[PDB]
C-alpha cells in the first residue's frame, strides 16, 4: 500500500486455533485504531505457488474465520484485513498455514 487514502488500522500478527484436511481455522486480535466502525473482516488465501491474481477472497462477521476448499498437506498464504464504512484496510502480517497431512510425519 502506497499513496493511498487513510484507511483503518491492521492486525500486527495472526494466530491460528485449528485446521482440517480440507479447511483451516485462524484468528486475529481486534484493532484499536479502526478509524471508525469495522463492518466486516475480509480474508485472502492462495496457493503458495499461485499469485494474488488467482486467489480466493472471503470475509466474516468476526475476528475468527475458517477457509474451506483446500488440499491436504498444502501451504496456503492467508491474510486478514480491516474494512470500514470509510474504506478497506491494509492486510495483517503475512502467514503460512498448512492443512493436515495423512502421510505420517516422523518428527515435527
Coordinates of C-alpha atoms in Angstrom, one line a residue, residues 22-91:
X22 CA -10.0 -29.7 3.6
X23 CA -10.0 -26.4 5.6
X24 CA -8.1 -24.2 8.1
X25 CA -9.1 -22.2 11.1
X26 CA -7.4 -18.9 12.1
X27 CA -7.9 -16.0 14.4
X28 CA -6.7 -12.4 14.8
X29 CA -6.9 -9.7 17.5
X30 CA -9.2 -6.7 17.1
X31 CA -7.5 -3.4 16.2
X32 CA -7.8 -0.2 18.4
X33 CA -7.5 2.3 15.5
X34 CA -10.2 1.0 13.2
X35 CA -10.8 4.7 12.2
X36 CA -14.5 4.0 12.7
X37 CA -16.8 1.0 12.8
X38 CA -15.4 -2.2 11.4
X39 CA -18.2 -3.6 9.1
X40 CA -16.6 -7.0 8.4
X41 CA -13.2 -8.7 8.1
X42 CA -12.0 -9.8 4.7
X43 CA -9.5 -12.6 4.1
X44 CA -7.4 -13.6 1.1
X45 CA -5.9 -17.0 0.6
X46 CA -4.0 -18.5 -2.4
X47 CA -1.6 -21.4 -3.2
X48 CA 1.9 -20.6 -2.1
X49 CA 2.8 -21.4 -5.7
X50 CA 0.0 -19.3 -7.2
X51 CA -0.3 -15.5 -7.1
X52 CA -2.8 -12.9 -5.9
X53 CA -4.5 -12.7 -9.3
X54 CA -5.7 -16.2 -9.0
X55 CA -6.7 -16.2 -5.3
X56 CA -9.9 -16.6 -3.2
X57 CA -11.4 -13.9 -1.0
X58 CA -13.7 -14.5 2.0
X59 CA -14.9 -12.2 4.7
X60 CA -16.6 -12.8 8.1
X61 CA -18.7 -11.1 10.7
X62 CA -16.0 -11.7 13.4
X63 CA -12.2 -11.8 14.0
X64 CA -12.4 -15.6 13.6
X65 CA -13.0 -17.4 10.2
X66 CA -12.1 -20.7 8.6
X67 CA -11.1 -21.3 5.0
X68 CA -12.8 -24.2 3.3
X69 CA -11.8 -25.8 -0.1
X70 CA -8.1 -26.7 0.3
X71 CA -6.0 -29.8 -0.4
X72 CA -4.4 -32.0 2.3
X73 CA -0.8 -31.3 3.2
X74 CA -0.6 -28.0 1.4
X75 CA 0.6 -24.5 2.5
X76 CA -1.8 -21.6 2.0
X77 CA -0.9 -17.9 2.4
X78 CA -3.8 -16.4 4.3
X79 CA -4.3 -12.8 5.3
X80 CA -6.8 -10.7 7.2
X81 CA -7.8 -7.1 6.6
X82 CA -10.0 -4.5 8.3
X83 CA -12.9 -3.0 6.3
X84 CA -14.9 0.0 7.5
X85 CA -17.6 2.3 6.2
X86 CA -14.7 4.6 5.3
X87 CA -12.8 2.1 3.2
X88 CA -10.6 -1.0 3.1
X89 CA -7.7 -1.5 5.4
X90 CA -4.2 -3.0 5.0
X91 CA -3.6 -6.7 5.4

